[PDB]
């Protein structure tokens, strides 16, 4: 594999060097022009040797750091947890606030801090490479995948993508507000006294490490738990559905709409069943288009509904791949990065309907679906689909603003968490200064992957599905629509599938949805039955969130420092070293109080005094945690008593006297006035 | 030379000796020198090192309270401290740079413990009283 | 017990493999000093209170056994 990849890369780069002999200014054929554009992009080769090597080194280092990151329990440091096993289970299964908070903070303090300088260097190098490749910044190069030129009406500028994303998200926000309100109201019953009904959700209580998906929260937010979900795995087991006839049923479903049959060698070369322990193989369901009419599917398929839906998704992928077989090699791909996954996912969405299960025989014919079951299914779909849209948009906006330079390097987290509060509605449980690099902890951020693809793909599929339901002449709700036995819908889909990349993606969209740009109206039409139920359910609850409440705001003590007024001239600047000294003084005062009052030896440190909301006034909020227990925060009364006990030392450490060092809750005593006899 | 001496140590060359006389400077109302005071002193030394490395060499070195190693503690409150690299134990800051850092920010350390240049002796850092101004 | 290189905290070394090889083969003063201090600061500190409790309990048992 390494040799083949190296040979392919060498051939591709030498062909790219050769292709520069034909400038695009004199090319008139559209297909030839775009094929040359594919073969003329320099990529990382435009940089110097040292810069290219540094970029490769930092990319590999970030990938390895993310892959092999370890967090160790403070109680038993001898045991440590990776990310894929254990930590994901902790974040997706545990109901303990303390354990989830520990996992969240440990992962974001043991891996983000290591990825901060590497991500800074990566940003600088990628910006230089993109500017060398005639792009304003790296974000422009990323958005260039959607760029369309020279079509007289279908042209799509790179900058128009930002406008299209923001305008679309403005229409998703009303639904997400109600969904967030319902989720918060339901979570208050599971984590009492930790979630405020007026404030935002804590970051770690989202059923995932980063909060990208809310699927794992479905157990805590099921609308009607008494009514079971639709499961036909038992029916498959009773009817003895091995991992050989489910693909046959999927093929029949694809044919029913008019799509062509599978190739003869597809079944022979497939790996529909796991080869056991004798042969080792990956179990990620993937589609392979080896070329020359060679299409294969790899999957360790079991007897489960999830496996059935995944098989339908992979069959959609391979059908799309087969659609553009006649296209040249450079055109053997989708219209853009979002078309392929949407085409794959619409099949899974259609196959999961109870009507299809009843027709195929998995669901009993004497089964009448209730509206409660529909609400449960819609909410389960929503927690996965609508849950990730605000997070995806916020992450991509933050990355675009970082690459464009609109966010200063010393203001990354301060702006990232501010965006997360006011867009996603998620508040950090503990403050993070500029040392942390939380966004870099995500898989798609550290490994240099475009994230906007997951946004538009969410839209396109719905725009496809609705369109496929118009040709099929479906009168019921959108979520109940099925495209089986609809030759017109299959023909309409194939008309776009066969195009591939030979045509602009806008033209491909027009061939299905009849529009040139993405529209979120199909998503709202899909989620309307759930939207009405959520609106009716939130009669008493306060819909929305406030960007001021934080979980640590109750135990925070506010410090305001006025150096200039107390010292006049000869006043030192309040840099980070002064903040470190102040945190050390606070930790010393806490140690003194815990030793001379409670007679407990607690080894506080400068990292246990967390500081937030730093301002040029030198006015911030600090709170003291346990020495190695992040979930434990010292109550504000004890901290106030500690500060009162040893305020003189802190005052003398900075040469301030009780007026330029105000703790806003600790009122000093001037002293009784002695009287004559 | 056959044998060995029980006084030489590898860190003795780069160690700065601190002698503190709380009772003489404060008389009564003098706090006890427990481990918390030692932690505060180490934090002050780390802060001074940060200030010197930032305002002279323009290098951001994240020192910590665990990078100021202290040995030979005595009831006189007389010990030897030396500062290492932030995460490189084998790297010890040369004594000249530590002396320059202490001279740069001795006032803050003096005020942190309410001592004045006589009860906080660094044994190698001699303070300057100040030139005496003369009439015209 | 595990000690991890500060340059690459993602890699860590046990005692029987690696660390013993470092202490028995390396001729670098810096590397040997790092290994020594890392092992005695990442494992001794965890064994201090446990050893104190072990000392107290063993003393009580021995005194109960007429020693
Ligand atoms: C870090 O600090 C937190 C406190 O902020 C500690 O959480 C506390 O853990 C104890 C031990 O499990 C809990 O006591 C138990 O509470 C359950 C609740 O049903 C009760 O059934 C048990 O009988 C027992 O009383 C305590 O409630 C809990 N407090 C909070 C606020 O969660 C945590 O243990 C600390 N972590 C470490 C490693 O020390
Ligand atoms: C921790 O600090 C020590 C210094 O106390 C660092 O040791 C130094 O490492 C550099 C890099 O290898 C050495 O430079 C090299 O020296 C060899 C000696 O033959 C020479 O051949 C090379 O061309 C190069 O100049 C330097 O001599 C060495 N200094 C000492 C006193 O050992 C150590 O690298 C630091 N550790 C980390 C992780 O930064
Ligand atoms: C642009 O080039 C393509 C590629 O040649 C043309 O498509 C056909 O390609 C086949 C095989 O390469 C040729 O045998 C045909 O002669 C090409 N033309 C037609 C009409 O089939 C395409 O036509 C070209 N378009 C323009 C506007 O020149
Ligand atoms: C790529 O680099 C070459 C030189 O290395 C340069 O001539 C060319 O303009 C660059 N851009 C493209 C699109 O080829
Ligand atoms: C597709 O192939 C299967 C067997 O491989 C066959 O039973 C089926 O009839 C074929 N489809 C059509 C439309 O002929
Ligand atoms: C389902 O329909 C019944 C019949 O009117 C109604 O009482 C109930 O509230 C509905 N439930 C939902 C979730 O729409
Ligand atoms: C589609 O056509 C097949 C073949 O006649 C039939 O069995 C099935 O009931 C029809 N409807 C659906 C929803 O599959
Ligand atoms: C003010 O009174 C409080 C207790 O009444 C005392 O701790 C504090 O030292 C007094 N401040 C003075 C005397 O300056
Ligand atoms: C003594 O002189 C030195 C330099 O000559 C100076 O840094 C220090 O502040 C002086 N001390 C005073 C004036 O008290
Ligand atoms: Zn896929």
Numbering used by the authors:
A (entry chain A): 62 to 738
B (entry chain B): 603 to 738
C (entry chain B): 130 to 196
Quoted passage from the original study:
Several plasma membrane transporters import proline into the cell, including the Sodium/imino-acid transporter 1 (SIT1) encoded by the SLC6A20 gene. SIT1 belongs to the SLC6 gene family of amino acid and amine transporters, and the larger Neurotransmitter Sodium Symporter (NSS) superfamily. SIT1 adopts the classic LeuT-fold expected for this family of amino acid transporters, while ACE2 is composed of peptidase (PD) domain and collectrin-like domain with transmembrane and neck regions. As with the homologous ACE2-B0AT1 complex, the structure is a dimer of heterodimers where homodimerization of ACE2 is mediated primarily by its neck domain while the ACE2 and transporter subunits interact via three distinct sets of contacts.
Further classifying the 2:2 ACE2-SIT1 complex data, there are two distinct conformations based on the relative domain orientations within the ACE2 dimer. This movement between open and closed conformations occurs as a 30° rigid-body rotation around a hinge at residues 612-617 in the loop between peptidase and collectrin-like domains. As with the ACE2-B0AT1 structure, a second dimer interface is formed by Gln139 and Gln175 within the peptidase domain in ACE2’s closed conformation. Further, the branched N-glycan chain at ACE2’s Asn690 is rigid and well-ordered in the open conformation, hydrogen bonding with asparagine, aspartate, and glutamate side chains on the peptidase domain’s H6 and beta-hairpin between H4 and H5. These interactions break during the PD’s conformational change, and fewer protein-glycan contacts are present in the closed conformation. Accordingly, the glycan density is weaker in this conformation as the chain becomes more mobile. Without a secondary amino acid substrate, SIT1 has undergone structural rearrangements that open the transporter’s cytoplasmic gate. The greatest movement is a rigid body 17° tilt of TM1a. Within the SIT1 map determined in glycine, there is no apparent density for amino acid or chloride, though the binding site is similarly resolved to the pipecolate bound structure.
